[PDB]
Paper text:
Pupylation is the post-translational modification of lysine side chains with prokaryotic ubiquitin-like protein (Pup) that targets proteins for proteasomal degradation in mycobacteria and other members of Actinobacteria. A single Pup ligase enzyme, PafA (proteasome accessory factor A), is responsible for modifying all pupylation substrate proteins and likewise a single depupylase enzyme, Dop (deamidase of Pup), removes Pup from Pup-protein adducts. Depupylase Dop is structurally homologous to Pup ligase PafA, although the two evolutionarily related enzymes catalyze opposing reactions. Rather, before the catalytic cycle of Dop can begin, Dop-mediated cleavage of ATP in the active site must take place to generate the Pi species important for catalysis.
With the aim to capture Dop in a state where the Dop-loop could be resolved, crystallization experiments were carried out with AcelDop, exploring conditions with Dop alone and Dop in complex with Pup and/or different adenine nucleotides. We were successful in identifying crystallization conditions, where AcelDop in the absence of other ligands features the Dop-loop in a well-resolved conformation that is not induced via crystal contacts. In this structure, 33 of the 40 residues in the Dop-loop are resolved, including residues P40–R65 and L73–L80 and thereby all of the highly conserved residues in the loop. The Dop-loop features two very short helical stretches (DLη1 and DLα1) flanking a long zigzagging loop. Helix DLη1 (η stands for 310 helix) consists of residues 48-52 (DFEEE) and is located nearby the nucleotide-binding pocket (NBP) of Dop, while DLα1 is formed by residues 75-78 (DEDL) and is positioned distal to the active site. The Dop-loop forms extensive interactions with residues surrounding the active site. In particular, insertion of the highly conserved Dop-loop-residue W47 into the NBP leads to the formation of a triple π-stack, where W47 interacts with H231 that in turn stacks with W453 of the C-terminal domain. Another π-stacking interaction is formed by Dop-loop-residue F49 and H155. Furthermore, a network of salt bridges is formed between acidic residues in the Dop-loop and several arginine side chains surrounding the active site. Superimposition of the Dop-loop-inserted structure with any of the Pup-bound structures reveals dramatic conformational changes of the Dop-loop and several active site residues. The comparison shows that, upon binding of Pup, H95 swings upward by about 90° out of the way of Pup’s C-terminal residue and displaces the Dop-loop, including residue W47 that moves around 11 Å away from the NBP.
Author numbering: 1 to 65, 73 to 508
The structure:
């Protein structure tokens, strides 16, 4: 599997003992508490959806003309290639560019560790606050926050085909991607458990908005790459996942569907009547019996429709690659199929793999011990605890501490990924430059690193416009042998020994 992708996760935030506490200021404290470990972001170090914050232009870039803390402007580039910032009045982590779902899992998991460490550091600074962070999507006050996925696609792929084949897939993906939620409806006052945190907050099929009138297919399309060649697919429908298996399947199955769409492989029409209604109805039935209504009149459970996408993906891979299928593609297909088979038989068999199942198992334990109905406030507390970033307080983290969840990566790899970038994207160059040459870097962003060389009047901008250049294979040996940023820049700007970047 090889496709540029990423995850941007907005974290829930709470400052105990401070009623109505300024979430913007708390979020700035979290980000600023980790700033010593990275470098300032340039003005353009922004995703398009950051337009929905104070004091920005149409691109999310800060404009001129209240303190910057109360405005949530803090924006830091990390040595692992990630970015840490404030969005929608919450701390947000954007992974480095990665090329496959296992690396997405790894650097996204490092983000949870970075958030936990940032909150710990914020408390230690003088006048600093004690701050709790949650990797979930709702605050139980009718508010929702986003876990965004980005996938780099060919600009020539017809958008109408992207929409028509992705909607039924996104309506049903929650059977394995959902994180679970206690309470039904946006206000959470309806009684019961549902598969997804986000489903109740969606209103339309296709649209540009992200923080209101939310669409199943968001149309923001601006890539961190040449827009003539590439489209960014920006997905906002998914819950933040704790389980590594859930995040892996979320990104990996979506990437396989995108490959089928780009190659024109799908001839079926999986269109669903009233997809927003179906999104909610699937979420609200954790017994997995609800049968969607397809436009052609077929009736299929969400699991059954996912199985139709799986069957197409297997045929696509067999026809395109034959017996030269790469290990990760084979693994995603096998885990997708096994998960769907087990979901149809007994979802509770998946408690080591899926967030909503692991969470439901904990909640049912409380219901059995204490004779609690679904409306009991304690169950909403337990729902939230599942997502706490602290290693001893988050319930997912306590399951992992006991070896009770399946993992794709080990903790030593997660710790390394807090500070070292992926090797196969431009995040390598960016992260390694910040680590080795940080003394001579003024700022960085997805598109360039800005060097300040002693004895040179002007700052030196090194562009990094292509996400698949500047990898370890391209520049690792050069970075190893250079002793200063002056030597590095002289090599990169030389016309005889060319570095294509």
């Amino acid at each position: 599997m090889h496709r540029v992708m990423g995850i941007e996760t907005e974290y829930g935030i709470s400052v105990p003992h401070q009623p109505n506490a300024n979430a913007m200021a708390a979020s700035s404290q979290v980000v600023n508490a980790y700033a010593p470990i990275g470098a300032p972001a340039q003005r353009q170090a922004r995703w398009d959806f950051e337009e929905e914050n104070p004091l920005r232009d149409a691109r999310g870039f800060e404009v001129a003309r209240l303190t910057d803390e109360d405005l949530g402007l803090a924006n830091v580039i990390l040595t692992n290639g990630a970015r840490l910032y404030v969005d929608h009045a919450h701390p947000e982590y954007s992974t480095p560019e990665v090329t496959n779902p296992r690396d997405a899992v790894l650097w996204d998991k490092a983000g949870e560790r970075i958030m936990a460490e940032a909150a710990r550091r914020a408390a230690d600074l003088p006048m600093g606050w004690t701050i709790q962070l949650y990797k979930n999507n709702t605050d139980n006050k009718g508010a929702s926050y986003g876990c965004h996925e980005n996938y780099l696609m060919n600009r020539s792929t017809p958008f109408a085909d992207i929409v028509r084949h992705l909607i039924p897939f996104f309506v049903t993906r929650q059977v394995f991607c959902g994180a679970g939620r206690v309470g039904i409806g946006a206000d959470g006052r309806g009684e019961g458990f549902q598969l997804s945190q986000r489903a109740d907050f969606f209103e339309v099929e296709v649209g540009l908005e992200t923080t209101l009138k939310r669409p199943i297919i968001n149309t923001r399309d601006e890539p961190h790459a040449d827009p003539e060649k590439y489209r960014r697919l920006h997905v906002i429908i998914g819950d933040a996942n704790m389980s590594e298996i859930a995040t892996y399947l979320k990104l990996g199955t979506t990437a396989l569907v995108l490959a089928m769409i780009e190659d024109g492989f799908l001839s079926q029409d999986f269109s669903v009547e009233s997809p927003v209604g179906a999104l909610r109805a699937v979420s609200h039935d954790p017994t997995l019996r609800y049968q969607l209504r397809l436009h052609d009149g077929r009736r299929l459970t969400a699991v059954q429709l996912q199985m139709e996408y799986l069957e197409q993906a297997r045929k696509y891979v067999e026809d395109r690659f034959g017996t030269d299928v790469d290990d990760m593609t084979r693994d995603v297909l096998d885990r997708w199929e096994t998960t769907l088979v087990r979901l149809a038989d007994d979802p509770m068999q998946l408690s080591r793999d899926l967030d909503w199942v692991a969470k439901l198992s904990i909640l049912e334990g409380y219901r059995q011990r204490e004779n609690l109905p679904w409306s009991a406030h304690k169950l909403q507390l337990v729902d939230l605890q599942y997502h706490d970033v602290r290693p001893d307080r988050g319930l997912y983290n306590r399951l992992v501490a006991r070896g009770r969840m399946n993992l794709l990566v080990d903790e030593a790899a997660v710790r390394t990924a807090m500070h070292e970038p992926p090797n196969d994207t431009r995040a390598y160059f960016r992260g390694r430059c910040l680590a080795k040459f940080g003394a001579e870097i003024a700022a960085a962003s997805w598109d360039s690193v800005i060097f300040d060389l002693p004895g040179r009047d002007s700052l030196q901008r090194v562009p990094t416009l292509e996400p698949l250049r500047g990898t370890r294979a391209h520049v690792g040996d050069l970075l190893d042998r250079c002793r200063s940023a002056t030597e590095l820049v002289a090599a990169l700007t030389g016309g005889e020994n060319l570095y294509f970047q």
